[PDB]
Symmetry: none
Subunit: 436 residues, 4 copies
RNA sequence: UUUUUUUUUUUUUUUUUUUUUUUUUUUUUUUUUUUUUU
RNA sequence: UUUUUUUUUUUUUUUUUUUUUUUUUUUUUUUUUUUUUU
């Protein structure tokens, strides 16, 4: 049944929106200031810093960074008669812990935590990707497309584990392998047993993510090495460059700004009654009547900022630019010529230059975002023997194979997925590559 | 965090200034004599000769040079009613060792040693550069600009290693290569292992100093030769003449005279409390209210001597003359027509001719001195995506950059790896004497403390000459 | 040249005897009490506890065992008019450190330390052998004969390393192997490097100890294992049971009681002038005119005690009983029917029962004790292939092969090794086995 | 060191005695009523029912037996002017949990729990032994002597595991084997893994309990069966009837009534200062000046009740009657003609017949109770040298014990390993009912404190009967 | 002519055992009573 | 119909580099002086 899942997610987002309402009440912010992305961003890093129970335990025994008992950051942006000012207001974790506890009807609301931390991962992937660490592990910078969910820490659950990319898992496992190579860390002690356990958990997440049998079997055989040394490093690099084309079935969770939920809940649109979905039309229509204000530099233009915000909201920064333009109805500029910077504001930037303006989120069309792979795969002793089939499959692969047969782009006016329209692009080589 | 580094350097310079105070107390010198550069210079060669533990061990087993048990030199200059007299006062190392130990609160203070020895290297580079050794190794005398930190011996640490120039490392490595060519010194013994170790330490210092990937890779491949013979000699000469334009990111440590620190500490300006920095405004403002006296020949003029002292203090002898003039506000005379000599006084020079006078160190402006490079190396292989991920479920093609996909996988036998000089040549051809560097940074005024608003300089004064030598 | 070695050992033993003279002066003991083995034994454990610089450093950071700042034990035995009384007199290390420093003319005298600690190892091997640890490592108790120098710690030098038995090294290496198996201790850290270094030092000591090429080569190949696991355990057990017959050339250092040296030095017999030797006639003739008193239980007999003391002095507890009887001239009782106990006295034993009496050390003959092996050996991919030659050599070995051709037992009256007498035993099967 | 163990046990028993003091304060009982065994017995079943965390968790999900939220039993006996009355006062666990927590200075005091539960096991073994379960598993009723610590559940730690008898472990393992035979319970699930783990823990407890190598090896080989079926049942029955004579080294923990500790603590005899021991003179001298009152039926005699109480206190119900009589100084009546019943009072017995009187615990002598075995197992394979080392350089043969040298090397295929019962039988035949044990140890007098001089007992009183049952 | 290195708790009651040795939970049992009965 | 684990120091000045980064000793040199001479 799907009604129970819809009711659960509706209750969750209703609690999130009511927490947004209460923070707006408590912060004494104006109506416009309650529609600012920066305030929600800072509040949600406060959120993660309050539920990072592992880091809370680590920092209680580590009193450093000066004035850091329980309070971090808090750069609240406020309006005086047109101008803007930031105040470093410090909030302790514990009261916000109870305000959450009262916001979800006595529950912890860890799932909502997973969705907010994933949405932060989505915005991070949209804005900046780290070839720095990618080459720190020595892997080439050609695979920036598989850094989805890279910023997500381990503390997230299965729902968080679903959206992390294959390359993110590759980086996380190579970190553990290099740590176990630097020092003899795999002893029979509890630490070795626990890192072992985390290793097979991440590995069966990996093998669940893939679709073709060959890569699943070679991941199975990579496990057979009780002592991860150097050979497994190139083995899993080969796995990664095979997943470049033999991509894993990774989900795309549609989370939206902290405000969008709050404005919807404030207006009285109860999500429990009519039901809510995370993959269907829902996050599209909530943005059809949503107003969002944002802060922009004197050199930054808002036109690219709105498109980057739509990237962050719908996690389409790793998709083809042509398709995103089709759903937008307007051309989406690649990152090569974006005359904009990161959404977050640096701690040293002055305030006389900063200017607030609206963001456009309306899209002409809507589409389903399933956790499936291209139809091209369906059309098609050690690790090297399977690398041979990897090579022959890569040779069989073509840049022409059309995927996603039987599905299409839909119009906004339809609610039950009745009749789609088939898109068709013949616009030469505009560039289906967000980076480069 | 940067507060801890500031506190550490403040404590270090406070200890240095207090040691200067105690030497002034012990030497029974007057107020004017405590503001003489020569006294600090001699005292600091005493300093290095007392912490040169390697040379101490070498000389204990080598009792030569006549009366040299523990005492060397010591030409202290003193005033009698206007006139000057030098006394060869000999100080043993050990008591000064304990006076240091009490001056840094029970610590050895080796970092301060590194900064004083670097400052001696700075003054040496400002005064005299050795094409003698540069052609002893046979390298042409055109590269005198890369002799920064040449006088620095190996005993300095990482902080000392940061400021040594690329050419200094080239000279040091060619010395070892020629020694290993003269005799079969790379045997499996401990000496060969230790010289090997020092070799890779100097080489990863080198590759850390560079910025572009091509030179970093060719330095990596130079390492692959287990037996350094003759080919590596021209290989690293090519490396050096490539670094002529593809310069390495070498730091510029701002050390000041032995007295300047002592006068500041004596007045009660504690550096631990307000914090201290080695790159920012700090050494500039301490010289804004510093008085320095110096010794000058009857033919030498003090006007060029003050500018040469500013060179030595701020290690700007290898920079453009126009920029140094802009910060000075007055024209800086190149070494071609400097009617002056070395700061240090020869052991045979008479004293009736010698005359003491003030030095000018005030500068109209101040600027940050980062360990970065210009901007003319970024035209080669660009980055970008190679694959795509389906976000929306739309019936569309999945664009794959296939010809690079084979390139990553491939699976054949590479021909060879020896043509990086070719990219060196093409980068040199791409380089122009017009490319402006250091975008987004500017020269600042003295009255500002937090780097608020700079002023952009602009020189159109023909070809006055941006070359300190020649 | 051999004169320099003789002069060095003579100077060393002269310093030792002068230290014995000064301890007799300082302790205010009588003439008889200066000829007691127990006093010298306690004083020499004080000696080792004062030069155990490693243990000194370990105990300074570990203030335990109640009153233990610098002083340990010290059960000095004294006579009142026939009866005996023990006093627990505590001496600190440091003053005895300087008294040594003045006793060896400003030198540390570490070699003398090695000889005293070896002589303690000799007495320990003579009295009690530990099958407890031998089966703690799981090795069978059949090899008690290779426990020579077992009590010797690592701190001894090359001279100490020469006399340690093959089985002692086997036990020491198995201890390190089991420690490295229990935890991942072979990391790239300094501890792993240092235990590695100690490992090859002990191994080339081992391969120096052996004589035949096959065992030297298999010890060389045992080294090739960078990770000592379980296979090397049985490999080196096979090495040990091969050394059972293919015995290693282990020296036998002839050290004598703390008093014997002191009495000789007190009488004015300077050893520097006439020269001294550790293998030749020397320790034999010094015992020809030496008087020794010892403490005996009311049930213990002195007849077996004197023979056990001769065992401890000449380290002949692992030799054939028949030969030791021949040099003695009297039958030597094996340990099976020795109605005696350990030489050292337990801390709880009462004093009214204890009785002091002389010990006999005179021997009818004298013999050289070289660090060579039996002449029987001269008559004759992995570890198992060499185990094959081990088995065939063992089969070629016979319990009849006579060894030590060209050498014989000598008389006391001869000084320059002129003419020996060939012994010949036909006394059935009296038993050439000290244990069992 | 032994001082730390003595201090720990002294602190533990001091906490126990202080808890007894506080229960006496809270229950408003008189001085005489505080010296009753029944009150302490009921209070200590309350104790075990409060720390039976496993049963607490099982009963919270199982609300049965009527009024049983947190309270069980509680038959407190009280005096009115000579007569006796029982009140069913119900106490919840949780407040007593905190009163313990405050009684042991913030600690849980689980060790004390182990000693009280062992002392309940001791009294149960003294009073009634279950041939009912012994024949439920089908084992003959001849082995009632190995039911020591039978009532002890698994929750006890290593200290509790030490005192459980061999037969108790045999019963516990046969229960698990029969459960695994009834249903396929050894699957790869967590339950199978955990019962497996408990199985090897109980088995290495077993092999630690034994002394001779043969039984230790056959227990090792019993483990090799991954699927415990029927053969292992008779295998371990043979193990048990071998342990009948080849007894295991099982300890005898000397616990005393709940009151005895309380009276000693109340008088101010701190056990931490002077030290306490569980095996030495200690529990003997505390009973030398201890007063105990008990409840007796109108038909029961107190003379046998005092002796049975001494049995329960010192766990001597499985020992020879003659020895217990010697330490007592009076004849100890075997259970065949004991005109008494169980110490605990049935829930339906009336109160007009019940009469309270003193108990005698004074003993003429004292003895150590070590966890060692007799002496009749040392006739088999002896040890000794196999090789020799040449000490003197003499022309002589090197004696080698060749036939054992092949035996150590060998290199063939062993026939089988299932004939250890054969050595069991031959050892049993070698065993005699005459072999005297415990050489070098004797019975001591009360006046001695440091184990100075014993007296050797000697019994020639025919066949009075060294068998408590039958 | 062959040599003083230190890494988290051991040992002289004694001669071939013993360990300074430890709070885990899985579907219904038991105090009318002492060797049967379900 | 698929899920909150914690182990010794990191990060919001910024968008693809830079590192919070460090006292080793091997057979005769150098302050008459600034680019030669041995």
């Amino acid at each position: 049944n799907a009604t129970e899942i819809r009711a659960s997610v509706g209750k969750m987002i209703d609690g999130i929106g009511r927490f947004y309402i209460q923070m707006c009440t408590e912060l004494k912010l104006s109506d416009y200031e309650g529609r600012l992305i920066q305030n929600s961003l800072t509040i949600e890093r406060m959120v993660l810093s309050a539920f990072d129970e592992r880091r809370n335990k680590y920092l209680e025994e580590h009193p450093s960074a000066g004035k850091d008992p329980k309070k971090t950051g808090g750069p609240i942006y406020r309006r005086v008669d047109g101008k803007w000012r930031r105040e470093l207001i410090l909030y302790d974790k514990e009261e916000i812990r109870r305000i959450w506890r009262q916001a979800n009807n006595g529950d912890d609301a860890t799932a909502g935590l997973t969705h907010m931390m994933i949405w932060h991962s989505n915005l991070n992937d949209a804005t900046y990707q780290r070839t720095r660490a990618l080459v720190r592990t020595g892997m080439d910078p050609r695979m920036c497309s598989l850094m989805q969910g890279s910023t997500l820490p381990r503390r997230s659950g299965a729902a968080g584990a679903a959206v992390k990319g294959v390359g993110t898992m590759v980086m996380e496992l190579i970190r553990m392998i290099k740590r176990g190579i630097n020092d003899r860390n795999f002893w029979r002690g509890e630490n070795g047993r626990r890192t072992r356990i985390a290793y097979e958990r991440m590995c069966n997440i990996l093998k669940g993510k893939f679709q073709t049998a060959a890569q699943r079997t070679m991941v199975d055989q990579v496990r057979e090495s009780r002592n991860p040394g150097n050979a497994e490093f190139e083995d899993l690099i080969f796995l990664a460059r095979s997943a470049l084309i033999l991509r894993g079935s990774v989900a795309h969770k549609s989370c939206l700004p902290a405000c969008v939920y709050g404005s919807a809940v404030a207006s009285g649109y109860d999500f429990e009654r009519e039901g809510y979905s995370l993959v269907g039309i829902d996050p599209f229509r909530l943005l059809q009547n949503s107003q969002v204000y944002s802060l922009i530099r004197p050199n930054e233009n808002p036109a690219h900022k709105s498109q980057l915000v739509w990237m962050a909201c719908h996690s389409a920064a790793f998709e083809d630019l042509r398709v995103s333009s089709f759903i937008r109805g307007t051309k989406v500029v690649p990152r090569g010529k974006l005359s904009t910077r990161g959404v977050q504001i640096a701690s040293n930037e002055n305030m006389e230059t900063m200017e607030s303006s609206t963001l456009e989120l309306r899209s002409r069309y809507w589409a389903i975002r399933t956790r499936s792979g291209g139809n091209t795969n369906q059309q098609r002793g050690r690790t090297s023997d399977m690398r041979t089939e990897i090579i022959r499959l890569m040779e069989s692969a073509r840049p022409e194979d059309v995927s996603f047969q039987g599905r299409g782009v839909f119009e906004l006016s339809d609610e039950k997925a009745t009749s789609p329209i088939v898109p068709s692009f013949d616009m030469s080589n505009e560039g289906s590559y967000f980076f480069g």
